[PDB]
Ligand binder design. Structure first.
Ligand SMILES: *[B]([O])([O])[C]([C][C]([C])[C])[N]C(=O)C1=[C]N([C]2[C][C][C][C][C]2)N=N1
Ligand SMILES: *[B]([O])([O])[C]([C][C]([C])[C])[N]C(=O)C1=[C]N([C]2[C][C][C][C][C]2)N=N1
Ligand SMILES: *[B]([O])([O])[C]([C][C]([C])[C])[N]C(=O)C1=[C]N([C]2[C][C][C][C][C]2)N=N1
Lengths: 212, 214, 204, 200, 202, 220, 196, 202, 196
């Protein structure tokens, strides 16, 4: 009896100086079949924090529910909402609590920090985490990471002036890298959900992808 | 339950304009043997919810009694509040995941069909605790055979009628009887609308064997 | 996996009237690097190059046996071998050991003799030919390479534009792989020249 | 992972690489393998990223609580002993961590190595990780107890550089720390690519 | 093992073989597989001898106590539900194939099937054991609605006899039981009384 | 992989997808799965790609040699026997499940050969990982003695069912119509999938990549 | 674990190896020779399987010596390293594959000094310096940091000492003595053993 | 798979299902299991499809050549002996359950059984396949000596129909064959023509 | 492999042990101490499992030191060796059994010197001399042939050298330094380390 199931799905996260984009595909699968074509992996935690998970859907559904409850309990005793950094630090301890029967989930929290600048936290299945600028996790994480490194991090480029990451240029980048991941990865496809975390709230955009 | 005993095959499910229709053959298989050919694999939770489970039949009977008590318990209070199709689906997802986390799951794959507050709900819960919603569902071998047919009708006609969805369910049941080696030609058809949950059958399909002569 | 024992990655791209073939130079046993100038790309005849990835011992064996066959073929029917003919030759060699195959995924790239039409292809361990129109990757970091080429490759690039694309794809693909890197060698095959330069990569 | 530590005449030098891997794939290249327990306590990490991170953070919380009750900073020997007893409970359960506790308490500079297996020894020069074997070569060769601060920084940087050149699981940058009597200080964080251009 | 239970208007008819084998050896050649759970409630045991005896004793205890508190003849469905509970609870530890069949004032003659997993299903007739596989086609082609208490006894004897010849784990004598409102009537069928079928010969 | 075939009024219609995966990654989005055995006989192949090619290439050369000797048109039985006998001799180690269809003197015949060596002569068949999806379309809309255009539409729907429901199949749809007087190899027949248009350019301007060494060589 | 090492200079190759033969926990020999003289300017260092090393090194040697007899001239270091690599690679998928790691050192008149590294999977690789065994991990970094292409013979031996001294204090095995040789234009020269 | 062969005065009657399953999926729902070895000699195949087809082709070749040299209709026992030889020779490599049945001028209508191991035994009627386990009791209680060519066709159709309902590996249509001195007569029984038995219901 | 050794004389016990702490193929420490001072005249030498040795030796030590505090007098060598044997034997069939081999040396005022040998299965045995590890096989025979019951302290140290010298030339492991101690009526005395 296997308690885990690979359901696929990729989640992206890019942090700006005033925003934070968290995108993911909406295809749930198993083996070679497609469960549903409409299953986004992005969840709105607070008003400035969005979590994205991929992997075993059973654990994603449970982890997300636990995080929702932990946020409510924290607001009851501390009388204030939990910050992005506090939600990342708390997730680490929750993932490591099941260290000998871990959640098969790849989480990528994206929001805004105290200052007001975009924040992105990448997590590992057992709980390890760190804050970065951009991050890709899922079944196409290895296909997208290198592109973001080159395009956003300006790695391996000798003659570039390194222009600031604007919200309009990052919106195209997320759409572009996911259109390339749907051409190679068989777990990525059908629809792309994009959540933009700004100071005026969380916006949501949906773009179609390949269905084959 | 590490190893299932008497199991059931695929359960179909498709949402239509004003309700949800669910089909399931009435057969309890013991390996490759058709042991029980008259068992109902569809249960009516309450007035707006119905359930169709595939897999271990003993687990389905345990869930049938654990759900029946819940509905009865809630009706005793009579405060107006009642479990919706979405609330039952949620409860089942937590029950399936909890069992799976304790290394002792209920070998089943359910299809929850309901109709409350003007919305048709079609849920799906497996033994690992994996759950989602969709316009049309199919478990067991129906995901490889019936799912493709249901999805090919909902792509050009997203909204279906009661008669259209029912005619599509019969076509899928007939295709499952030709290719699934663990299915029977005797099935039940449950429908949940504004009037409630109604079960019909046993029904049969119109199988043709012209290809046997060629 | 046996293929991930020595690491390495080969890439072939197509341009207007040119082809490019790049490869990593790190030779190493598992986690330890031995030399940083291992040859993974071999010349099969002026405008025809073959890049091999996988087990280093099978990379040298397959390159030597293919050369042995290629020499006899060119002497017999006194003419230059055609890119498509070499693929069939290589595929046939790999399929002889169908149940005890060589651990190497070849990547052929070159211009057709006389017509000078670009040609790139890749084969699996048992010799399964796959002729494409854009690019072909082979190595321990194909996923990373697949993502780079998919969003960088353009339909009709020139020699200079093609060199920049294949170099940026390899440099960013081998930086995500641990057992791949330590220098990158690129060969740009044109109609009258064969430019070969080693890119400045990370020595990690 | 490649982390080294050695105590010379002017305190303790701590250096580490910044690269996480998920098999052949390079997960990250900006991971901080050196965690600060407090102003006079440093802790290195090698092995299980989640294992070392959670247990060193647990040790840091224990050291802060200890200082509130006894109204004094914990020693380097007590800090390592605490951590050693923590991981011993889960011995032979899968825990993977090779830390190095460094600090300057009452008996001068102290450097202890503590792994998940059960080891807990003190020394003058340690090296944990998959690239530790390569780091040892350069370390010992250039190690001297009367090394100057500038010469000690060079040795630690050069030792991590050569280890990342030979080991595939070590790379990124080279974070260097210097523990003194007044407390540890962040010396530098040179990138391996820039070190390669300087050593060539 | 080859147990069988059929029902008629009045009540039900039970039947079983009597062979208990431990490998290729018959440890008990006259085993009594039909176990009385109550006055008008019996049960055919199949599977593990130790598991079926333990469960039958437990159910008999629980049913007896339950019937003394309610001051009424126990329902056949109640006995079957008790069996089902233990069969499902300890499904990973027990190996039983109980067939509960009896007669009560409410529903009359009933036959319940409680297979290995622990599921409970009511049928007009049920067959269990290792030798029941060979008579699946026979019971489906011979059973007819409206059988009397006399035809049911001949139907059960015929099916059990056919399973005893093909199965190595089934044999010995045949223990029948006809439960009605009047009471229970046991009957054994030995050598000459056991239905015989001419073996095809050239 | 989704390969299928049917037998219509006066001919055979073969179809297949064009996606080739190397695990859960698309290696080739336009590979040919319909192989030529002879002028009147074609073959759709799934299973092990390398074995599917080598087995069909060998049988096609054997059928070509046989055709030159006899001087007549090859039969579908001959191709079936050769394949099934060779496949059986390797004891299933040659993973090659193909759909053999052609038209000879006896008429149009469609066979399905499995890796172990078993064959089946049916009016319609489906192979591959998306075989159950294509079979559902054939078991819901197939009618005997269909028109050429009707058979092409029904076989296109079968390949489309597999392409959109199976993760191992995608890209385009390949068709192959073999009749008593013609052989129409339509590749591609239908393109249900198309890469999305770029939202921005990522061109690598010259001089963006540093170079440590450089050596040019002038070829004749 | 046995230890081999090679250092190629401007016009010479410096090779060294441990001379310890051991069975289970005891050292049976403290003056064992792991170097095989293939020719007048070619040395084949071999380590690995108990019986495979000698069987393989002697077969190659026999053929290399046979080559000179019938031809009148010796095989070059490159050709000798390719011949041995081809023979080890042929047995790899055979009935009896030799599990041996080796280093080939030689000096070609029109090519200078050559140092070849080979593992047990028959993967040939020319290198400026190399090592085999569990002690290679500890000494490869020392080499890297101190080795320069124009290194002189005197400094090559001084550099060798450093690597062997590192093994003395860091390695868990007992390697007290090492065999040292040098190949240049005047053939192979025996150098004083480095003992500790 | 459910194959069956019975014999009467004139010749023999064959029968089989048509389902070919690869797991829980029916790859071929109209398989022809009855294979002609010669003019008046047929054979029912069961077990592995690839193994039974390979052997049948080989035997058909050997029997055809043998019959052309002897210039006489081949004996049914000769065909069965050939099958037995290959079945025994490669018993560790093949998985077949062939039933050779035909008619010859010497012995008339004969039915031979060649099970997995490779043994050969002549019977008046034989059943094979995975679905033959459920009809063992039915054939033993229904078979009677003296059946005509018409009763044999109804006997085979009845037994095959009963096995198709209980077995998951058996189903589809029913392919019959009546071989006499006059020749062979094939016949298929589809949906409505397939014998039906009222399923016990409450 | 770690090495322990004990030699009991007429009125003294001589114990020695290697001071090498090692991880995989490298020696992390060359001055490690494997001796635990249980009391004023009791030494507990411990080797074995990585984490078990210290955990077990410190637990015994704590209890032996506790015994003296509450009672005013120390535990005898025999009682201390029986207490440790009883504790190791209780964990043997428990959830977490310590895999440690040890030697207990002590001097009792009314009983003289005592040398106890204990394996990981908690089997106590008094002996005139003993050893632990893979080096015990090579040195136990030397002891047997040269050890006499009336051996003097000076000859006991000379005899110890012979055993350690045998390890230097025969053992495959690297044990260059050894810790030496002696227990008599004046307590425990630190002897100069024997280095090679
Ligand atoms: B080091 O390489 O040891 C490094 C030290 C950490 C970052 C403090 N460890 C890792 O890189 C690392 C790798 N992993 C897992 C390996 C198996 C798959 C999941 C990740 N954890 N830490
Ligand atoms: B039957 O064959 O299934 C039968 C049913 C029982 C009698 C209720 N079972 C057995 O034959 C049987 C035999 N045993 C034991 C095996 C070990 C030795 C003691 C008998 N258990 N069930
Ligand atoms: B029967 O069920 O025993 C039947 C008899 C055959 C048709 C003579 N066997 C099968 O059903 C069967 C199926 N297969 C293969 C399994 C692998 C895929 C191809 C078919 N082999 N025998």
């Amino acid at each position: 009896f296997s308690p885990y199931a690979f359901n696929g799905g990729t989640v992206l996260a890019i942090a700006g100086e005033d925003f934070s984009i968290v995108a993911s595909d909406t295809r749930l699968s198993e083996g070679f079949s497609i469960h549903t074509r409409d299953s986004p992996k992005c969840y709105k935690l607070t008003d400035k924090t969005v979590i994205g998970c991929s992997g075993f859907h059973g654990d994603c559904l449970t982890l997300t529910k636990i995080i929702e409850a932990r946020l409510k309990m924290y607001k009851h005793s501390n009388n204030k909402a939990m910050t992005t950094g506090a939600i990342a630090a708390m997730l680490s301890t929750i993932l490591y609590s099941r260290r000998f029967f871990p959640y098969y989930v790849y989480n990528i929290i994206g929001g805004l920090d105290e200052e007001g600048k975009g924040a992105v936290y990448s997590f590992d299945p057992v709980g390890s985490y760190q804050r970065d600028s951009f991050k890709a996790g899922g079944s196409a994480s290895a296909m997208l990471q290198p592109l973001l490194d080159n395009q956003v991090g300006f790695k391996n480029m000798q003659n570039v002036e390194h222009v600031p990451l604007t919200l309009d240029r990052a919106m195209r980048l997320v759409k572009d890298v996911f259109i390339s991941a749907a051409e190679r990865d068989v777990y990525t496809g059908d629809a792309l959900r994009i959540c933009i975390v700004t100071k005026e709230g969380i916006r949501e955009e949906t773009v179609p992808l390949r269905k084959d | 339950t590490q190893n299932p005993m008497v199991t059931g095959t695929s359960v179909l499910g498709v949402k239509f304009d004003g309700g949800v229709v669910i089909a399931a053959d009435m057969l309890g298989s013991y390996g490759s043997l058709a042991r029980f050919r008259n068992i109902s694999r569809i249960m009516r939770v309450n007035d707006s919810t119905m359930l169709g489970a595939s897999g271990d039949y003993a687990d389905f009977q345990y869930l049938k009694q654990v759900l029946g008590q819940m509905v009865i318990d809630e009706e005793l209070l009579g405060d107006g509040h009642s479990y919706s199709p979405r609330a039952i689906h949620s409860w089942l997802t937590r029950a399936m995941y909890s069992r799976r986390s304790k290394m002792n799951p209920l070998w089943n794959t359910m299809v929850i069909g309901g109709y409350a507050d003007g919305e048709s709900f079609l849920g799906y819960v497996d033994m690992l605790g994996v759950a989602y919603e969709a316009p049309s569902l199919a478990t067991g071998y129906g995901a490889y055979l019936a799912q493709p047919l249901l999805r090919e009708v909902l792509e050009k006609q997203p909204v279906l009628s009661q008669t259209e969805a029912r005619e599509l369910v019969e076509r899928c049941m007939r295709v499952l009887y030709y290719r699934d080696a663990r299915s029977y030609n005797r099935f039940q058809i449950a429908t949940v609308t504004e009037k409630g949950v109604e079960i019909e059958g046993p029904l049969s399909a119109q199988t043709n064997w012209d290809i046997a002569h060629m | 996996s046996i293929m991930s024992y020595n690491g390495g990655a080969v890439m072939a791209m197509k341009g207007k009237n040119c082809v490019a073939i790049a490869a990593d130079r790190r030779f190493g046993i598992q986690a330890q690097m031995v030399t940083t100038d291992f040859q993974k790309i071999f010349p099969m005849g002026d405008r025809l190059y073959i890049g091999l990835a996988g087990l280093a011992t099978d990379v040298q064996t397959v390159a030597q046996r293919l050369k042995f066959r290629l020499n006899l073929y060119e002497l017999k029917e006194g003419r230059q071998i055609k890119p498509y003919t070499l693929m069939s030759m290589v595929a046939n060699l790999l399929y002889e050991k169908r149940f005890g195959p060589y651990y190497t995924e070849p990547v052929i790239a070159g211009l057709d003799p006389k017509t000078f039409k670009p040609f790139i292809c890749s084969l699996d361990l048992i010799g399964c030919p796959m002729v494409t129109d854009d690019f072909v990757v082979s190595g321990t970091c194909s996923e990373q390479m697949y993502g780079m080429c998919e969003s960088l490759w353009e339909p009709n690039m020139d020699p200079e534009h093609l060199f920049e694309t294949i170099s940026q794809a390899m440099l960013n693909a081998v930086d995500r792989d641990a057992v791949s890197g330590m220098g990158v060698i690129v060969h740009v095959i044109e109609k009258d020249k064969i430019t070969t330069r080693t890119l400045k990569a990370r020595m990690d | 992972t490649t982390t080294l530590a050695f105590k010379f005449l002017h305190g303790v030098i701590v250096a580490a690489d910044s690269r996480a891997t998920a098999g052949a794939y390079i997960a990250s290249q900006t991971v901080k393998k050196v965690i600060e327990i407090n102003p006079y306590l440093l802790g290195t990490m090698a092995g299980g990223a989640a294992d070392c991170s959670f247990w060193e953070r647990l040790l840091a919380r224990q050291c802060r609580i200890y200082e509130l009750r006894n109204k004094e900073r914990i020693s380097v020997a007590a800090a390592s002993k605490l951590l050693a007893n923590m991981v011993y409970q889960y011995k032979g359960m899968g825990l993977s961590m090779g830390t190095m506790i460094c600090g300057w308490d009452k008996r001068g500079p102290g450097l202890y190595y503590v792994d998940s297996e059960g080891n807990r020894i003190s020394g003058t020069a340690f090296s944990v990780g998959s690239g530790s074997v390569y780091a040892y070569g350069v370390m010992d060769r250039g190690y001297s107890y009367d090394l100057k601060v500038e010469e000690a920084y060079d040795l630690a940087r050069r030792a991590i550089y050569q280890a990342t050149y030979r080991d595939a699981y070590s790379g990124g940058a080279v974070n260097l720390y210097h523990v003194r009597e007044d407390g540890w200080i962040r010396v530098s964080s040179d990138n391996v690519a820039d070190l390669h251009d300087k050593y060539s | 093992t080859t147990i069988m239970a059929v029902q008629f208007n009045g009540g039900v008819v039970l039947g079983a073989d009597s062979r208990t084998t431990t490998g290729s050896y018959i440890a008990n050649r006259v085993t009594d597989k039909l176990t009385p759970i109550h006055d008008h409630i019996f049960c055919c045991r199949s599977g593990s001898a130790a598991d079926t005896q333990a469960v039958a004793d437990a159910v008999t205890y629980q049913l007896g106590f339950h019937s003394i508190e309610l001051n009424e003849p126990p329902l056949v469905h109640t006995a079957a539900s008790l069996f089902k509970e233990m069969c499902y609870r300890y499904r990973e530890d027990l190996m039983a194939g109980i067939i509960i069949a009896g007669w009560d004032p409410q529903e009359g003659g009933q036959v319940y099937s409680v297979p290995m997993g622990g599921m409970m299903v009511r049928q007009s007739f049920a067959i269990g054991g290792s030798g029941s596989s060979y008579i699946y086609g026979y019971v489906d082609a011979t059973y007819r609605e409206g059988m009397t208490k006399d035809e049911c006894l001949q139907f059960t004897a015929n099916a059990l006899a056919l399973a005893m010849e093909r199965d190595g784990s089934s044999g010995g004598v045949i223990r029948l039981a006809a439960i009605q409102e009047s009471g229970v009537e046991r009957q054994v069928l030995l050598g000459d009384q056991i239905p015989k079928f001419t073996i095809a010969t050239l | 992989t989704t390969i299928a075939g049917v037998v219509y009024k006066d001919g055979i219609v073969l179809g297949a997808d064009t996606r080739a995966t190397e695990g859960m990654v698309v290696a080739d989005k336009n590979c040919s799965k319909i192989h030529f055995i002879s002028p009147n006989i074609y073959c759709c192949g799934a299973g092990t790609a390398a074995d599917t090619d080598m087995t069909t290439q060998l049988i096609s050369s054997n059928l070509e040699l046989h055709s030159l000797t006899t001087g007549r048109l090859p039969r579908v039985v001959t191709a079936n026997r050769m394949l099934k006998q060779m496949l059986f001799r390797y004891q299933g180690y040659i993973g090659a499940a193909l759909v053999l269809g052609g038209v000879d003197v006896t008429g149009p015949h469609l066979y399905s050969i499995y890796p172990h060596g078993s064959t089946d002569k049916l009016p319609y068949v489906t192979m591959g990982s998306g075989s159950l999806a294509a079979m559902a379309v054939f078991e819901d809309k197939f009618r005997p003695d269909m028109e050429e255009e009707e058979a092409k539409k029904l076989v296109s729907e079968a390949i489309a069912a597999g392409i959109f429901n199976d993760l191992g199949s995608g890209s385009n749809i390949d068709l192959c119509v073999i009749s008593k007087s013609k052989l129409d190899f339509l590749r591609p027949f239908s393109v249900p999938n198309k890469k999305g248009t770029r939202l921005g350019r990522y061109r690598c301007e010259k001089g963006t990549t540093a170079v440590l060494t450089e050596k040019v060589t002038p070829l004749e | 674990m046995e230890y081999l090492i090679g250092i190629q200079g401007p016009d010479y190759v410096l090779v060294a190896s441990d001379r310890v033969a051991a069975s289970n926990i005891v050292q049976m020999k403290d003056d064992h020779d792991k170097m095989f003289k293939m020719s007048e300017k070619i040395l084949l260092l071999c380590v690995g399987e108990a019986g495979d090393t000698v069987q393989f090194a002697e077969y190659i040697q026999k053929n290399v010596q046979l080559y000179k007899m019938r031809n009148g001239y010796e095989l070059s270091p490159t050709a000798a390293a390719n011949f041995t690599r081809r023979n080890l690679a042929d047995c790899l998928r055979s009935r009896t594959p030799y599990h041996v790691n080796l280093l080939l050192a030689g000096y070609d008149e029109h090519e200078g000094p050559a140092l070849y590294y080979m593992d047990y999977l028959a993967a040939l690789a020319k290198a400026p310096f190399a090592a085999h065994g569990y002690g290679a991990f500890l000494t490869l970094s020392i080499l890297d940091r101190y080795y320069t292409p124009t290194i002189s013979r005197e400094r090559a031996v001084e550099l060798l000492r450093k690597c062997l001294e590192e093994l003395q204090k860091r390695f868990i095995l007992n390697l007290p003595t090492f065999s040292v040789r040098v190949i240049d234009k005047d053939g192979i020269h025996n150098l004083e053993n480095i003992a500790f």
